[PDB]
Amino acid sequence: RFLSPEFIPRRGRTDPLKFQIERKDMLERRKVLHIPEFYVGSILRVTTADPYASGKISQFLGICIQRSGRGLGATFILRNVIEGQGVEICFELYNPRVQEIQVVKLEKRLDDSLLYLRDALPEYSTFDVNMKPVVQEPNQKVPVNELKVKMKPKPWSKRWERPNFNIKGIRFDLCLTEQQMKEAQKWNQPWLEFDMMREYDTSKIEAAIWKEIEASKRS
């Protein structure tokens, strides 16, 4: 079972009724628009109504580098290099102007966010806008593309080698020396892994969310 990540609310003092009501609108909009399963690292094509585009329809293809937000506001960022110009668009999953979301290639990466592609070599952010969808077999495990990208020289938009980022899909061996790596470890927080009270267990939250999803589809 894949539950799209915007259905699991962040920890907080919000009254659960509010998430229930919001889930009902997310599920109604999903009846109109099929929102497919995707991850950071999947190649998507989004079609949107644009009052100023030619034909009043826009299509963008790119790699999902971020999925963020919760509820009806939840978004994802598609990134592509177009005529050698890097570009990215943050789409709203439930914006009624979205006409179609197509998963050209369904895959997963070694990291939950690919914002470091802004500092990787342009090839790792370039995807053909007319590439044909790859077929995904039924009841098959989602593939994890284990590409470790090569980076541009420093400085980067963020300090990707710092432990707080916990990035695994960068060829740090090529771009950073051992002394540069030793410095970054000074920000490591080994106790953080074991702080049991920081863990946010949403297993029981998801079970109830699945009952609502099944209830809406049943009726």
Partner RNA sequence: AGCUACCUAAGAACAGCUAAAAGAGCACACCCGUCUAUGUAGCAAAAUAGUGGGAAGAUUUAUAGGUAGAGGCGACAAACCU
Partner RNA sequence: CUCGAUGUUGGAUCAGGACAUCCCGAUGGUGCAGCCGCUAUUAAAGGUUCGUUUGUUCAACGAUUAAAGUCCUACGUGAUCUGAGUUCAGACCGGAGUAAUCCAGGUCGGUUUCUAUCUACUUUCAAAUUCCUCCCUGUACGAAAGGACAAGAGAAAUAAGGCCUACUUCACAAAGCGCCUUCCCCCGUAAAUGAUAUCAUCUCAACUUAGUAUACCCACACCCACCCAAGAACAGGGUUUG
Interacting residues toward RNA by CB under 7 A? 10-14, 66, 68-75, 77, 90, 92, 197-198
With CB under 5 to 8 Å by kind, the binding choice for 50 among another protein, RNA, none is: another protein
Which residues does 25 contact at the CB level (< 8 Å), separation at least 6? 72, 94
Q: How far apart are CA 59 and CA 63, in angstroms?
A: 14
In DSSP terms, 45 is beta-bridged to 61, 102
With CB under 5 to 8 Å by kind, the binding choice for 70 among RNA, another protein, none is: RNA
135 near another protein (CB under 8 A) = no
After which residues does a break in the chain occur, C–N more than 2.5 Å?
A: none
User: Which residue among 108, 118, 158, 162 contacts another protein (CB under 8 A)?
Assistant: 118
User: Which residue among 3, 68, 96, 152 contacts another protein (CB under 8 A)?
Assistant: 96
215 near another protein (CB under 8 A) = no
Q: Render 159-206 in DSSP notation, one character per residue.
A: -TTSTTT---SB-HHHH--HHHHHHHGGG--GGGGG-GGG----HHHH
Report in angstroms how near the CB of residue 20 gets to another protein at its nearest. Answer: 9
72 near another protein (CB under 8 A) = yes
**Among candidate residues 91, 71, 72, the one with its CA nearest the CA of residue 80:** 91
Report in angstroms how near the CB of residue 5 gets to RNA at its nearest. Answer: 11
Number of chain positions touching another protein (CB under 8 A): 55
114 close to 79: Cβ distance less than 8 angstroms: yes
CA distances for 219 relative to 17, 22, 26, angstroms: 21, 18, 16
> Where does this chain bind another protein (CB under 8 A)?
12-15, 17-18, 21-22, 24-25, 28-29, 31-33, 48-54, 56, 58, 60, 71-73, 75, 82-92, 94-99, 118, 189, 191, 193-197, 199
